[PDB]
Amino acid sequence: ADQLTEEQIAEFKEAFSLFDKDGDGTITTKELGTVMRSLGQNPTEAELQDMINEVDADGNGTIDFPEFLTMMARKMKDTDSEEEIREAFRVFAKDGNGYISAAELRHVMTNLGEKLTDEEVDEMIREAAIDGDGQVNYEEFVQMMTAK
């Protein structure tokens, strides 16, 4: 009802606090704009009040948890899942290439400027330890998206 299986809720849960500064249990525009900007879009002031307008949950410039994703959930309905995953990589990959690093986890959140500790990431870093090196390119980055 509120919390599902770890990886099932893993995205919208964590992406629940992404926007929610106030968190009346909804998502506001001032948040949705602070979000988008980190993906490489035109930083507009109305973009957030506009983005919640068409995907209006409450229409007071607030979007709920089942609506914000309705577009990625749409990619679940539509078979456009093949051409998006490579551009969805570009989201973080501003280098147009992408290299193997488990440290990437810390660059995505700091791309927004999130604050984490050395031990927080020592676990989030070890939560991705591969072969014994600890780096991960587009292989695990896309698989992160392709896997449910």
């Binding site: 770890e6 990886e7 893993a10 995205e11 849960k13 964590e14 992406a15 992404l18 979000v35 988008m36 980190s38 993906l39 879009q41 983005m51 914000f68 994703l69 577009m71 990625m72 749409r74 990619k75 998006e84 995953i85 551009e87 969805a88 990589f89 570009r90 989201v91 973080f92 990437e104 986890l105 995505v108 959140m109 676990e123 989030m124 070890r126 939560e127 991705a128 980055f141 992160m144 998206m145 896997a147």
Partner: peptide, 29 residues
């Protein structure tokens, strides 16, 4: 052919990027 069999000990992230592959659909041109 070659078996490896993965093991489960720690939980995955699937958000610190998924919450970025999710918003990459709002205005994908």
């Amino acid at each position: 052919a070659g078996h490896m069999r993965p093991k489960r000990r720690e939980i995955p992230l699937k958000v610190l990027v998924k919450a970025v592959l999710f918003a990459c659909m709002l205005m994908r041109k």
